[PDB]
Structure formats: C-alpha cells, structure tokens
Design a protein around this ligand. Structure first.
Ligand SMILES: *c1cc(-c2ccccc2)ncn1
Ligand SMILES: *c1cc(-c2ccccc2)ncn1
Ligand SMILES: *c1cc(-c2ccccc2)ncn1
Ligand SMILES: [Cl-]
Ligand SMILES: [Cl-]
Ligand SMILES: [Cl-]
Ligand SMILES: [Cl-]
Ligand SMILES: [Cl-]
Ligand SMILES: [Cl-]
Ligand SMILES: [Cl-]
Ligand SMILES: [Cl-]
Ligand SMILES: [Cl-]
Ligand code: NA
Ligand code: NA
Ligand code: NA
Lengths: 117, 117, 117
C-alpha cells in the first residue's frame, strides 16, 4: 500500500513518528504486510477546505484490491479518520480521504513489477 | 472536487488568495458546490516543461462524473487555462492540466465515504 | 509523459540537473518525444519505506498507452531503476515506482485537451 498525508500544517507541528504510527495503522486497517507499506508526508503545503485555510489534511490511500468498494472503504475511512483526527488534532470536517485501487502490473520494484515477484 | 496546483514558482511569487479565487473558479467551471471544492497549492517545487525550467504549473482536477470525456474537459481546460494564465502570468505553453474522474466510494468524509452521505 | 520524483532527500542533496537527465531518460525509456515530457521533483518530504526513514524515493510515471502492461512496465522499471539508483545513490530496496496510464482526453494543453491537438 501507499499512504500519502498532505497538510497545511508545518512540519514542526506534525507529531514526531507520525509516519511510523501511520505505517502501522495502515497495515492493520487494510490488512496488508507492514513492511510493504509506504508512507509519505507533505507538510506545509497550502490547503483550502470548505473555503477555509485553517489546518486540514488529505489522505491518499492506494492499494491492491482492498479499496475498490464503498463497502470496505467505509470501514477503512472510519479507522483512518479515528487515527488522523486523534494524531493531528483536527476535526472530521478538516480531513478528506481518497482511495485509489491499484494492480501489481503498475507497481515497480527491484527493476521489474509486482506481477513478476 | 479536488484541485491541485503545483508550480516551480515560489510561494512569495504566488498571488495572495489564489486558492480562494481558484476554489470559486472551480465550482463555476465544473458546476459543483463551492463549499465542497478542495484546493491545494504546492509552490517552490522543481518543474521542467518542454525541456525548460522557466516558471510553469500543473493543474490536477479530480471530480465525480464531470471530467470523464474529451467533450467536457475541452470546455473545462479552456476556462482553467484562461484563469491560470491570467492569475499566474504564464503563457499557455507553461501550463498543463490533468483530469481524474472519481467515484463517491473512493472519497472519505466524516468517518465514512460519500456513498453513504 | 509525466514523471514525478518524491524523496526524503533534501534539495541540496539532489544532483543538479537531475530533472534534465531524468527528462531525457524518460523520453528514451518510454519512447516519447523529449519536449513533451514533464518532470517534477518534490525533495525534503517525509518518507518511510520498509518501516525505515533512511533516504528513499518514489517515482510516478504517467503516460499514454505505454505503461499499461506488466510486460512493458518490467522493461521500464529496469531502466528507471538503473537510472535512479545511479543518480540518487540509493539501493533498489529504497526506490518504488508506480505507473499510471493516461488518455489524451484527460490531458489539458493550450486551453483544450490532447484529444483536439
Ligand atoms: C503496498 C503493498 C505492496 C506489497 C508488495 C509486496 C508484498 C506485499 C505488499 N506493494 C505496494 N504497496
Ligand atoms: C468534490 C466535491 C465533493 C462533494 C461532497 C459533498 C457534496 C458535494 C460535493 N466531494 C469531493 N470533491
Ligand atoms: C506526455 C507526453 C505528451 C505529449 C503531448 C504532445 C505530443 C507528444 C506527447 N503529453 C503529456 N505527457
Ligand atoms: Cl513545513
Ligand atoms: Cl493553507
Ligand atoms: Cl497493496
Ligand atoms: Cl516557496
Ligand atoms: Cl524548477
Ligand atoms: Cl465531485
Ligand atoms: Cl529540501
Ligand atoms: Cl523521512
Ligand atoms: Cl504520453
Ligand atoms: Na513531517
Ligand atoms: Na502558496
Ligand atoms: Na530539486
């Protein structure tokens, strides 16, 4: 899986180790091996949500066949929201998630793609 | 909708309130409620366009069923281009747009997904 | 094509001209005109890979009908990996690639979309 957290919060205001905790949370929420989860945090960007620029964040979740249905994404969202709101000290209205399902043929590792690994 | 503007222009060189104006422009161009439009600006990144690193920008537009056909995207592009070129003081050749259609099941809000809202 | 390199390496530690060289490498690897290749580099972001935050990078490759099959992506990956590992001084285990196929109708240029150009 790939998890990206983009926020208008400055790096300094972002809880140390958030990437680690988020890595773990992801593996659990999506039920994928922790050591294959990639976390990326882009802090200090300019963000506007609900015509407001108070602190807020976007969470992008990309994974293979686990985020392709409103069914499971609802469950995921709940978990992630619970995680982020807590960690970042933000209210639900200041967090949005986007799920992108992927396929092994589009993921490249060790000079090839998942498909041949 | 989700609008992301990534540029090699420094934050300082980016017109104050651009996110607000872009938020409004988006709602109009795509005909979606203004209060549900998310704008993100990543300034000061390294960008190369046409083997050149002079100022330029990328606009990413994600929305539900309104950017899925060359038909409507042509209309959108025209509007967005008119907006950006003006605002950013860039020529057409220094701006590129990418449209990504989305589906409520992949958008998470308030601990669930659009699908159940 | 669109190539994005996101890394936890600081801008200063990123080899001067990397975008240019990467632009060229892309055109070659994907066999698309060099002057239509867009390169973006986001340095100094927070990245965790294999539960580790040592230097690492993500490469996102978006293009029209050339990165849609494990077949060709394997070839691409090999090339890109060879390029990045070399340039960035990173081992294979610290680089991940993601391929996103696109369609002219979703790419906007000169106030319209590729489709009408
Ligand atoms: C998330 C997970 C993976 C992956 C790769 C190998 C084995 C398990 C999981 N790849 C990309 N993103
Ligand atoms: C753009 C628009 C929306 C949205 C959500 C609720 C009601 C209207 C529009 N969501 C995501 N992106
Ligand atoms: C990559 C390549 C192109 C493009 C545009 C015009 C002519 C050739 C190639 N567009 C977007 N990304
Ligand atoms: Cl920051
Ligand atoms: Cl902001
Ligand atoms: Cl996965
Ligand atoms: Cl800046
Ligand atoms: Cl630049
Ligand atoms: Cl929408
Ligand atoms: Cl940096
Ligand atoms: Cl890091
Ligand atoms: Cl292309
Ligand atoms: Na951070
Ligand atoms: Na800005
Ligand atoms: Na750079």
């Amino acid at each position: 899986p790939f998890v990206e957290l983009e926020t208008n919060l400055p790096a300094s205001r972002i809880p140390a180790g958030l990437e680690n905790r988020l890595c773990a949370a992801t593996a659990t929420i999506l039920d994928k091996p922790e050591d294959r989860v990639s976390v990326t945090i882009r802090p200090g960007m300019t963000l506007l949500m609900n015509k407001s620029t108070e602190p807020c964040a976007h969470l992008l979740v990309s994974s293979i066949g686990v985020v392709g249905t409103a069914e499971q994404n609802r469950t995921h969202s709940a978990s992630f929201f619970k995680f982020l709101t807590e960690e970042l000290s933000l209210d639900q209205d200041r967090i949005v998630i986007r799920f992108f399902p992927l396929e092994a043929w589009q993921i490249g590792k060790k000079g090839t793609v998942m498909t041949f690994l």
